[PDB]
Input
Amino acid sequence: RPSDKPVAHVVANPQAEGQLQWLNRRANALLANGVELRDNQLVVPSEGLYLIYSQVLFKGQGCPSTHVLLTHTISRIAVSYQTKVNLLSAIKSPCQRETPEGAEAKPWYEPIYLGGVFQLEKGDRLSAEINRPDYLDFAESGQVYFGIIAL
Amino acid sequence: SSRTPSDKPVAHVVANPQAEGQLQWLNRRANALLANGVELRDNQLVVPSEGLYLIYSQVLFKGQGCPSTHVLLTHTISRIAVSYQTKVNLLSAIKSPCQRETPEGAEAKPWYEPIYLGGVFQLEKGDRLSAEINRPDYLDFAESGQVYFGIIAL
Amino acid sequence: SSSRTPSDKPVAHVVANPQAEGQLQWLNRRANALLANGVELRDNQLVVPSEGLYLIYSQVLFKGQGCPSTHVLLTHTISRIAVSYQTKVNLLSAIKSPCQRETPEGAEAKPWYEPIYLGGVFQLEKGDRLSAEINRPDYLDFAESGQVYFGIIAL
Amino acid sequence: SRTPSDKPVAHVVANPQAEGQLQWLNRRANALLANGVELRDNQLVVPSEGLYLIYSQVLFKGQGCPSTHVLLTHTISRIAVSYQTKVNLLSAIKSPCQRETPEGAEAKPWYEPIYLGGVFQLEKGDRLSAEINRPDYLDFAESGQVYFGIIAL
Amino acid sequence: ARVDQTPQTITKETGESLTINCVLRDSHCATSSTYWYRKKSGSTNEESISKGGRYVETVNSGSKSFSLRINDLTVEDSGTYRCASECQYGLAEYDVYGGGTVVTVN
Amino acid sequence: ARVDQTPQTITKETGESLTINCVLRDSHCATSSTYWYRKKSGSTNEESISKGGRYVETVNSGSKSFSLRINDLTVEDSGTYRCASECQYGLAEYDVYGGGTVVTVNA
Amino acid sequence: ARVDQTPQTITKETGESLTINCVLRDSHCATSSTYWYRKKSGSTNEESISKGGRYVETVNSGSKSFSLRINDLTVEDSGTYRCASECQYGLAEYDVYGGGTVVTVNA
Amino acid sequence: ARVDQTPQTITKETGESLTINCVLRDSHCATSSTYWYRKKSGSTNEESISKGGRYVETVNSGSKSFSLRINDLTVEDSGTYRCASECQYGLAEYDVYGGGTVVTVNA
Amino acid sequence: ARVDQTPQTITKETGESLTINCVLRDSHCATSSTYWYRKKSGSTNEESISKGGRYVETVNSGSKSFSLRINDLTVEDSGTYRCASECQYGLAEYDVYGGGTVVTVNAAAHHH
Amino acid sequence: ARVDQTPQTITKETGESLTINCVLRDSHCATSSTYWYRKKSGSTNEESISKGGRYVETVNSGSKSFSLRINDLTVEDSGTYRCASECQYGLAEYDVYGGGTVVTVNAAAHHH
Output
């Protein structure tokens, strides 16, 4: 057994160690009815109301003393305005103390989720990105993802 | 009188507040829904028809101090399909509940950490989704919409 | 500019005002924000224009610096006061402790960041008043864009 | 300037940045595509009936001779509106490796070029295409090492 | 008193959709054997609704509650609807019923 | 950004021809509904610039650019001048802003 | 595991013949449009095995299984050999993989 | 060598302004259809820079040279910047490119 | 492929009648200059079939196909039969061919 | 049934393209001399539709079928349409007809 409308749910590639790359040909992932996967960018195939969401899980085995800043932003470049602008963004500081040091063991995990409804046009290229792709944990399944759905 | 006719299988279930330390999903409460075919068997939602769904759930964890540092908080949505009869995770998240300082003396520190999951997936007839947590002893269903779980036929 | 898509489904996506000070004043006339098809923004509250199933979501970004009371609780709730039951009730809620006891006594500079996201599907009626709320409007980080927002969409 | 050429012409060059494939480019210095010749999907579309000169060159380079015995081929095909099947106009075969996989020695890259040219009567809408069997040995490193073009005589 | 059918009387117009809810109060009856019966005004037959299509059934075993939404209502859907369940504990086996009437105006 | 106020931080004489040009980049905004706002030096209130007399605006509908020439420049005209436009596409309606400062010296 | 390679880690000196079996567990994957890959001494990358040749492929759609008999066994390379299939149901399109190690010595 | 990017490797500090100049050496290319493309360090895609605001373009046709002054430099502005132009003589149409890298450290 | 013979291999018996049909695929070839050739089994020279008497030729111009019915079949008419056509567009003149083999078996074999 | 007009009753809206197809069953009629007649609703005129512009005519001799595509449909293009063909064998010369009616509704013209 029909279809629906423009939809996408892409997940990071686990066999891309230390990089963020969205894949569509993988278990329980979608990219159909016109949405294109360019250079880690989703191309909106129709003008309308869309739901954009993404989650990233950051994991580290130690806390540095630089006050780590983890960022996650979903960006949009439109045909009408040819500049990268943030639609959804969030920042988080995972390590509060002064590094593990005395007891060197800091297996920390911190997730961030983003979601919202937007009006997008033909040819708009959306991109979900993070500032420190060295703490990405694509070890298990559906812990890092990014998708859109035409409402 | 139910004056509003509406369709598309939908569900928004909330934890049972009067269920000690366990995650029992309810639909017969205030602003919670379970209609148009979605069944709740054993804290598991049964998809009533094949199509595209939006799946979401949040869990809020609260504890009255961190005694040990051996605690990992998880929140996962799993799926058992007719085509592939093994439970696979659709959405997953992990969170460190106690950053550090493990309360040594004069603990008296209630800690709160939320986790939210959401995404779009294709489900088939008979698919059984379940929202699960690692330590149901940290559930804070005392307030209102702090823990919930639902699907909606888009 | 002429548009080629007659879209409907009552929708709203409002983002916080940065020019505002220590308050969560919602705007609709800023860049990637929407408020159309009957939804009005009254008293920082979204008024549902039609019955049906809606998707409610909101995000808040909290940022501070140093822990004065050592035990701060950050709250974020979306409430609904309906024509059928005229009391403000929580639909989605979350609590978060940003500072876990230890407060650096003597040293300086330690801005903390803790975000909170909420989302769910609900049955709303005509005239229902939805509200996005926080407990400490002095820790709001409405810098940059799309860090705090609030919206509904008719599914 | 004065360019009253007015004649169907095309001289396309291989993409240096496109790897392991033969994608034809025309917006490159000393390459042309004008006066009716259109380039669709790696195919040249003849704009007018007449006598044409069709030519193409490919340069193959590999960094050793494996034991597969590669048979490098190069053919220009023509699919006509009158006869909707691909027929070869010009073809050539070349065997570059007649020795065993170098046992102790290595390196020794082999280079083999192939050139094709001829005069034909083509019709409007005929689609000519230049193709090779092993596009992983294409050496488009320098300038004008792989090319393909027609000119209305 | 063992099963509580809540909408005891509904009056809807042709085309709409009625939902009937039943809640189990005996913890020995199982939500795995729920049954639905209609008796059309003027007939002497209790017919059994088949679970599928115009008749959608939603069950939650945690609350021991099940529902029956009927769409595309005609005037041929005017009659008394009952829900049913199969109970079994020790050596005991029994069944449970309720009550509720439907009328559709054209 | 979506609007480009070009003559930033100009410092001239108590003269004139204080033209500030703004370039529209968002193809949803129209040069017909243009607005200008000034905020003096040291003050906490943004006033609405009215056109006519000292504040003349030249519109270029072709170039999607508008300018604001300030003549007979005085010393009370020291402040941050901003340009604005009202944009509208499908169901979206918003407005856009820029930035640009003037300082006036006297004889 | 969606795909089950039965014959895995083994050390077969050059010269042998035995089929490596992969069984499909996802009923959306097809016994057709299947491809095979073997490693490169387990050091660099996996190779893309071509059609027929020194490699044997057994396909039966009834049993939803495909196999790889190691014929004409010379010293090509060692490593983990994977099988793969193209799966697609309705709006979904995905693929599945395998894995299994062979080590070859010589006389 | 058909357009010459002069600043090959430049390293400026956060908060500065770098100008990259390109000189046309092919007398068929025009300073009118000039375009700019940047490739952010770590990505394999060249994106297209827009002309306006923080990216100001100065063109002088006499020497057939154009420049690209970029202000308010962050640490996100590290990459390979290339310039381009559209050349057209008679029956020929082509475009030309260059090369030059920027790295910005914080302060 | 230009020109497609439909009856590839036929095995009729002595005293019958076979028709072999050919279909043109090139829009430059005409059904007006059609020719037929037979090659008697056991010899190499391809003879030109003359259309008359036992060899009758039919044509259908709509689909650009022609056929050749052979009546009064004997046992000496076993061979490889080909059809041919003359194509001509601008500065070009060529011809096209096909293929189809005949085996005709005889009688007697009165099993006693 | 001597040419068969296939779309008997069609109903299109203002702004469209309707195709009317006729296939010849009489092996004497030729696809070369084809004519079309439309009769505007309420009058009996059966004026002759011309081949050009809004009326494009597609002819295919292989399947012996012709069509008449009408684009940019208005409400003044509603009527009974017939197809025709000219047949000729020995001493006989005749023509053949069909039938098919169109009804066009407007677009309601939503006033702001």
User: Anything to note?
Assistant: The two ends of chain G are 37 Å apart (CA to CA).
